[PDB]
Amino acid sequence: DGLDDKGQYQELKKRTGMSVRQILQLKTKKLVHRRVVNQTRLGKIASDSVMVIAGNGDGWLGLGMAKSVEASIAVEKATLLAIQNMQPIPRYENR
Amino acid sequence: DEEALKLKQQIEAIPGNFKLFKQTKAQTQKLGAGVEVRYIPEQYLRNPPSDASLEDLMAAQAHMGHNTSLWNPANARYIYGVRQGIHIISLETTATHLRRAARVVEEVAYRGGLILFVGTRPGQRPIVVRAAELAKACHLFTKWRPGTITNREQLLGGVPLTVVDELDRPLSGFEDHLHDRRPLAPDLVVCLNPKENMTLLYECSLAKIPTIGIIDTNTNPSWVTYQIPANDDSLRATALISGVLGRAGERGQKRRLEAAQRGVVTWKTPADVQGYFELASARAADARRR
Amino acid sequence: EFNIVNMRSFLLNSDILTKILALKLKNRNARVIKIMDVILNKANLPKINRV
Amino acid sequence: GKGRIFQAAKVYQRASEAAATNIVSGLPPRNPPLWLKAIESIPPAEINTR
Amino acid sequence: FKLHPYARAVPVSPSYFTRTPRFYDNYLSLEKLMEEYEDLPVIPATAVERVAWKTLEDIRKELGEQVKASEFARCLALVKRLNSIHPDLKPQEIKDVLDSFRRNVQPFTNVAKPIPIDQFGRACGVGKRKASSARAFVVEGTGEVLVNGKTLAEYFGRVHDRESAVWALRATNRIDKYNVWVKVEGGGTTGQAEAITLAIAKALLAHEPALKPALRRAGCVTRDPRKVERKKHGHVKARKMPTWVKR
RNA sequence: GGUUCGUUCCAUGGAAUUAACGUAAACCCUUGCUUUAUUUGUAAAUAUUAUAAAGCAGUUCACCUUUAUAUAGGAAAUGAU
Ligand SMILES: [K+]
Ligand SMILES: [Mg+2]
Ligand SMILES: [Mg+2]
Ligand SMILES: [Mg+2]
Ligand SMILES: [Mg+2]
Numbered sequence: 001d002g003l004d005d006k007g008q009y010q011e012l013k014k015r016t017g018m019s020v021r022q023i024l025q026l027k028t029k030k031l032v033h034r035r036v037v038n039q040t041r042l043g044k045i046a047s048d049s050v051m052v053i054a055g056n057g058d059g060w061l062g063l064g065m066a067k068s069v070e071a072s073i074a075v076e077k078a079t080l081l082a083i084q085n086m087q088p089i090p091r092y093e094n095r
Numbered sequence: 096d097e098e099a100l101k102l103k104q105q106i107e108a109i110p111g112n113f114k115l116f117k118q119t120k121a122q123t124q125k126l127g128a129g130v131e132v133r134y135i136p137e138q139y140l141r142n143p144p145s146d147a148s149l150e151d152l153m154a155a156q157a158h159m160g161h162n163t164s165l166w167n168p169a170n171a172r173y174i175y176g177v178r179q180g181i182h183i184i185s186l187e188t189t190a191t192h193l194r195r196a197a198r199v200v201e202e203v204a205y206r207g208g209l210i211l212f213v214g215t216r217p218g219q220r221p222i223v224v225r226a227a228e229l230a231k232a233c234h235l236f237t238k239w240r241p242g243t244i245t246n247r248e249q250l251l252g253g254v255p256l257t258v259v260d261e262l263d264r265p266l267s268g269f270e271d272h273l274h275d276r277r278p279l280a281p282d283l284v285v286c287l288n289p290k291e292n293m294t295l296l297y298e299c300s301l302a303k304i305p306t307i308g309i310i311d312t313n314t315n316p317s318w319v320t321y322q323i324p325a326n327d328d329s330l331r332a333t334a335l336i337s338g339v340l341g342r343a344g345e346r347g348q349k350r351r352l353e354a355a356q357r358g359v360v361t362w363k364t365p366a367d368v369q370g371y372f373e374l375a376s377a378r379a380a381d382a383r384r385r
Numbered sequence: 386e387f388n389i390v391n392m393r394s395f396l397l398n399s400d401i402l403t404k405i406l407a408l409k410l411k412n413r414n415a416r417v418i419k420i421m422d423v424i425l426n427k428a429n430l431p432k433i434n435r436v
Numbered sequence: 437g438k439g440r441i442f443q444a445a446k447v448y449q450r451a452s453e454a455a456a457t458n459i460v461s462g463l464p465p466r467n468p469p470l471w472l473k474a475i476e477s478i479p480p481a482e483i484n485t486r
Numbered sequence: 487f488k489l490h491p492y493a494r495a496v497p498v499s500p501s502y503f504t505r506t507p508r509f510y511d512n513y514l515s516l517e518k519l520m521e522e523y524e525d526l527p528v529i530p531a532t533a534v535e536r537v538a539w540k541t542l543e544d545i546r547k548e549l550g551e552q553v554k555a556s557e558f559a560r561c562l563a564l565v566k567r568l569n570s571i572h573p574d575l576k577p578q579e580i581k582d583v584l585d586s587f588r589r590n591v592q593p594f595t596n597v598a599k600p601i602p603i604d605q606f607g608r609a610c611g612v613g614k615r616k617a618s619s620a621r622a623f624v625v626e627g628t629g630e631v632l633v634n635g636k637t638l639a640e641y642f643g644r645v646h647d648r649e650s651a652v653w654a655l656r657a658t659n660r661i662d663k664y665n666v667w668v669k670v671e672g673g674g675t676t677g678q679a680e681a682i683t684l685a686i687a688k689a690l691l692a693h694e695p696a697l698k699p700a701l702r703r704a705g706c707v708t709r710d711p712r713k714v715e716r717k718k719h720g721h722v723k724a725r726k727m728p729t730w731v732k733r
Numbered sequence: 734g735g736u737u738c739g740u741u742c743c744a745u746g747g748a749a750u751u752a753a754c755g756u757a758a759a760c761c762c763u764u765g766c767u768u769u770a771u772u773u774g775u776a777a778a779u780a781u782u783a784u785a786a787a788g789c790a791g792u793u794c795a796c797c798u799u800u801a802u803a804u805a806g807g808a809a810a811u812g813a814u
Contacts (some may be wrong), residue, residue, distance in 0.1 A: 007426040014277040204473035241748030282471040300444040366466035
């Protein structure tokens with residue numbers, strides 16, 4: 001339905017196996033955003049390490065971490081990497 | 096002239112001699128007395144046993160552990176003692192664990208599960224291939240490419256699949272599903288040398304896949320789900336275990352298919368194919384309305 | 386004499402492709418890195434055997 | 437710590453919980469793996485106990 | 487009309503998780519044929535007809551896989567072993583399997599045209615050296631040589647060139663049995679002198695083709711491809727660079 | 734760890750599988766050869782200089798040596814070419 005006009009969720013649509021509209025109902029939130037730097041033969045190379053958490057709000061939480069020179073791609077990586085790492089968390093009385 | 100002409104006669108006489116020699120071999124080959132042949136090297140492949148006793152396991156050197164110095168004290172539960180400088184694995188512990196794995200390989204095959212027999216050693220190729228034929232499973236006799244389970248989307252990308260019904264006969268109409276479906280993963284791995292390939296067993300524990308392994312005295316028993324304490328360095332003990340597990344799968348597939356003929360399916364559509372069905376109805380609903 | 390050819394997709398010609406992307410970036414609030422991915426995503430490559 | 441966390445003995449406990457509920461709240465859980473019921477009554481043996 | 491209620495994806499080949507599925511499937515078939523037809527007699531190696539088996543690259547391309555050279559080396563040994571079976575005793579299954587490994591490659595054929603001899607007995611050999619092209623008309627004679635109408639002395643003022651022009655006839659000791667009428671164009675003194683060497687040699691071979699082994703060691707059969715290198719921008723000459731100032 | 738002009742190739746590693754650019758290949762000139770065309774170029778001519786379109790060609794074959802038997806290398810005016 002045009003929800004994913006970039007194609008980033010297609011690769012994830014196979015691992016977890018659920019519609020793209022259902023991937024947008026998950027609660028995502030960027031938690032950490034580090035500005036790391038690697039010294040190379042061509043000078044400093046600054047990257048953006050981010051950690052994103054994904055959960056449906058009913059006992060599933062996934063943690064993902066990725067980095068890239070672009071802050072936009074680093075968040076989309078962890079987002080996809082966190083939705084596929086979701087695991088059931090036991091909760092007493094769901095509270 | 097006369098020298099090379101001799102070969103022409105010999106090369107032309109091989110068919111006649113072979114036929115005559117084959118016939119003569121059926122006349123006087125067995126006349127003296129009956130030989131009590133009770134062991135043939137290639138007997139675990141031509142006709143493996145359904146169940147291994149203590150005599151079979153001992154004769155196959157399934158109790159020879161590694162040097163006492165090179166041991167993992169974690170698996171001190173299966174050791175019987177010490178002799179000839181090596182640890183002797185208990186023949187009873189090897190049989191009880193082998194009978195349990197056979198019950199695991201049988202049920203997984205009874206529920207339509209995909210088994211994988213993994214033995215990667217110089218001479219373990221005929222054993223694994225034979226076990227797979229019986230259990231209708233997949234074989235692997237070379238270095239397991241790291242990531243074939245956790246990174247299956249890339250490694251097993253172009254490998255073809257097929258959809259089969261209860262009676263294992265292919266179904267038509269899943270052409271669009273076999274292009275977006277992601278590659279498969281073994282529902283059960285049977286490693287004949289867990290000490291060698293730990294990258295495979297780790298992907299199974301990381302992907303929640305049961306495993307069966309032959310734990311030698313120096314192998315870490317926490318690498319698999321169902322251990323089989325035995326000698327993995329012996330080519331004669333591995334062919335016996337694989338035969339038992341191979342026959343277990345065969346006996347499991349027989350029950351599954353025999354039950355299908357009675358309209359009793361021992362398994363339900365996997366989640367992956369299940370989701371495709373729901374989308375099919377959604378797309379079909381539009382045709383009904385429109 | 387004119388020989389105007391009609392293109393089905395705007396990716397089969399670099400002249401048409403570089404102008405569409407340019408008009409998209411002229412907006413002050415244009416997301417550069419995102420406008421490029423939406424165009425690449427529309428460029429389908431044929432299945433091939435890398436071997 | 438050169439070793440790795442091997443959870444091969446809990447593949448059932450882990451798979452049984454991940455298949456109990458659905459990630460998409462409001463829908464029934466999809467069918468579990470074909471091996472979840474085969475080893476339902478065949479737990480692993482106790483390892484690492486001197 | 488709808489889909490079957492029960493369905494599950496199953497791999498086609500049993501070698502689904504191997505490095506090269508399509509290859510092993512064909513390799514296990516050979517191992518299977520080498521188990522039931524192993525009792526058949528063999529033929530000595532010297533009596534096996536030469537066969538051009540496919541190379542490692544051909545299998546990689548037809549199978550679309552990356553088969554290891556070591557794993558293929560052992561699969562090829564089975565092909566050579568199964569090929570040793572006696573033809574009359576060899577079954578039809580092995581024959582078909584062995585016909586898929588034959589390499590049907592034919593190298594391109596480029597046969598040079600032989601230099602003819604005119605009705606009057608004059609063969610025209612062509613030789614070039616770095617700027618020029620000669621045309622020697624060698625005939626049976628007393629040993630007269632005319633380079634472009636003039637004699638060998640009135641054309642080449644340097645005896646080093648006279649000996650190099652008719653070196654072919656000198657190494658073979660036939661200066662006194664052939665008459666040459668050369669016609670050169672372009673190049674310089676040495677460029678034309680050495681050009682005539684390859685012309686008379688080629689023309690001489692038209693009369694006595696058995697002299698090539700001698701002209702080979704005399705150096706009158708090889709065409710020297712050395713050529714003046716072009717001038718390159720930034721250089722004073724082909725390679726001479728201008729002065730470099732560090733400061 | 735070997736080998737290669739070369740992250741080339743082979744083998745192997747308790748983690749690898751791959752994509753793009755450079756590299757390589759290919760391209761233009763040049764070299765031998767085949768076919769085509771013969772003017773404004775070529776003495777004649779049954780076509781051989783020149784002109785210029787296309788195609789083929791190499792480390793190919795032979796000889797010697799060769800590791801883990803997996804990948805090869807050497808010899809350079811007196812093997813062929
Ligand atoms: K020409
Ligand atoms: Mg061992
Ligand atoms: Mg100069
Ligand atoms: Mg590698
Ligand atoms: Mg280049």
